[PDB]
Write a protein that binds this ligand. Structure first.
Ligand code: XV4
Ligand code: XV4
Lengths: 306, 306
């Protein structure tokens, strides 16, 4: 029992992290097979970095303008190219620690682990969600760009996130590993605004089931509701609409606990209108929305990887 | 910016995890150099465990009664012995992935990362604190025993925790790697009660400084307090006493921010008497107590390892 914000074990990813230096800019890269992926804003100087033309900036570089250090070992770069907002540096050596891996684009509401890095070195690992406004609520300092977000499925690392930007609200923005940003952000040195964020309703309900599964039931009631009556209250409280999709993939949890999805919706409604009256759920005084239904099943039944 | 509950990167520990089987009981062990460490209740049969005599049970075992699997590879046990609540299994092969490592016993209030495992395989990693009642608020299913908790300083893993027990309140109890329990718990199949828990006052204060550093200042006040007038209110609210040792360890954070420790104590005082009035701090509606001052400095300055 117990329920924690849990991250994937990070060993397959640590063995891929490297340092990339172009000029006086240093950040992190990802070494897979004979390729190193990093944020393209590594080729910027502080002046380019206000409104660069990256095509121009990259035409002006050669392979020798990029220093890639895998620990002590300096890797020799033999090619480079840009794919959207990421640079791809071809090196003369395949990474012997390359895991099985995929590149994946996640949707809003899905979670992943972030291995925050500096100068090529892991500093820590935490779990995050892609918010509905396509930002992430991260923990990132200067030098962290090029840290990756990932999931592990069985034996395979699925990379889904590379870090580029911090917004003025203190939240974070990035791309997938093909360099396409999540949301409407650009890799320039400008103050950029995110859309209004919303609560991931389906994850709140999943966490409510983790609660029940761990013996927190005080918030349950004898009532039920229709999906339409529930979304009416959801809009009032800045929650994402609940779909039938969403209802369905909560089925496993609903069945495990005996509580229909729309009974649990009725408890969320009363929690929303009445608050928590100084009580807690799974150790929190807020409705938590960064666990998916599969996160909840994984943890409340001990799925392993290797 | 941003502030998350961050665990250490887990790869140095992942490469030490193995599976141990005696009879039909399977759990996790830790392989360092040519020794495998695991909970001694692996030698129990389901009936032995209401109140076993482990010295009797172990004298009844031979090396061949232990199956140790490092993945596919079965390791030969060449010796065995018990140290308090852990078994030490001599194997004929030194682990090639053995990190620099220490064994450390931690105090209450200190934090560590847990690599939860099943059948030898990493499932996830999260950060915990040793509570003042010597329990941890973990997430552990059947099969998790022998999972370890740890810190990393530079290149060295300091193991501090090995998992054995779940208490009926849903929190967890275990040993150091010399097999001595934290708190008054024993490894048998009985309902065991932990003392009342208290809040780690020094960690709350550090976390208040993490807040300020990240731009949450709403809770600050013009006031100050004496360490004793502050400790009077704390006892009333089940907070641990603040010492001058604690005051001293908050020096760096106090200095980074410009806020004297006892000005911040006067802010914690008002939060306890008046609550947070529907506000949050660092995304939490409760006062968080599982960050030490050095967790806060590390994360808010990007300290790395290797
Ligand atoms: C790379 O490591 C870094 C990550 C960033 C630093 C602090 N915490 C983080 O997550 N990325 C940057 O510094 C990028 C560089 C651009 C060119 C891609 N810049 C931003 O994140 C950024 C720039 C501005 C800004 O311009 C004056 C105003 C306000 C916010 C802001 N953020
Ligand atoms: C080992 O893997 C397992 C870990 C434990 C199982 C479920 N969640 C966990 O953290 N450890 C145990 O099962 C131990 C074994 C003894 C022999 C050390 N037993 C308990 O944790 C335990 C037994 C009882 C109990 O009696 C049956 C009543 C109430 C609580 C409780 N906890």
């Amino acid at each position: 029992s117990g329920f924690r914000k849990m991250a994937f074990p990070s060993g397959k990813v640590e063995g891929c992290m490297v340092q990339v230096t172009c000029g006086t800019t240093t950040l992190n890269g990802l070494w897979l097979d004979d390729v190193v992926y990093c944020p393209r804003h590594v080729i910027c100087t502080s002046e380019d970095m206000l409104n660069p033309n990256y095509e121009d900036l990259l035409i002006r570089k050669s392979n020798h303008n990029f220093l890639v250090q895998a620990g002590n070992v300096q890797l020799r770069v033999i090619g480079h190219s840009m794919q959207n907002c990421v640079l791809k540096l071809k090196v003369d050596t395949a990474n012997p620690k390359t895991p099985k891996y995929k590149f994946v684009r996640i949707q809003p509401g899905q979670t992943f682990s972030v291995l925050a890095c500096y100068n090529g070195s892991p500093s820590g690992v935490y779990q995050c969600a892609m918010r509905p406004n396509f930002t992430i609520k991260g923990s990132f300092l200067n030098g962290s760009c090029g840290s990756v977000g990932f999931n592990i499925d069985y034996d395979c690392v699925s990379f889904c996130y590379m870090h580029h930007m911090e917004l003025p609200t203190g939240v974070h923005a990035g791309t997938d590993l093909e360099g396409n940003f999540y949301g409407p952000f650009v890799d320039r040195q400008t103050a950029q605004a995110a859309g209004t964020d919303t609560t991931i309703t389906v994850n709140v309900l999943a966490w409510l089931y983790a609660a029940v599964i761990n013996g927190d039931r005080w918030f349950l009631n004898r009532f039920t509701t229709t999906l339409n009556d529930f979304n009416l209250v959801a809009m009032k409280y800045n929650y994402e609409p609940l779909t039938q999709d969403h209802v369905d993939i909560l089925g496993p949890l609903s069945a495990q606990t005996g509580i229909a999805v729309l009974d649990m919706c009725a408890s969320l409604k009363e929690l929303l209108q009445n608050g928590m009256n100084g009580r807690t759920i799974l150790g929190s005084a807020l409705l938590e929305d960064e666990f998916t239904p599969f996160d909840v099943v994984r943890q409340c039944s001990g799925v392993t990887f290797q």
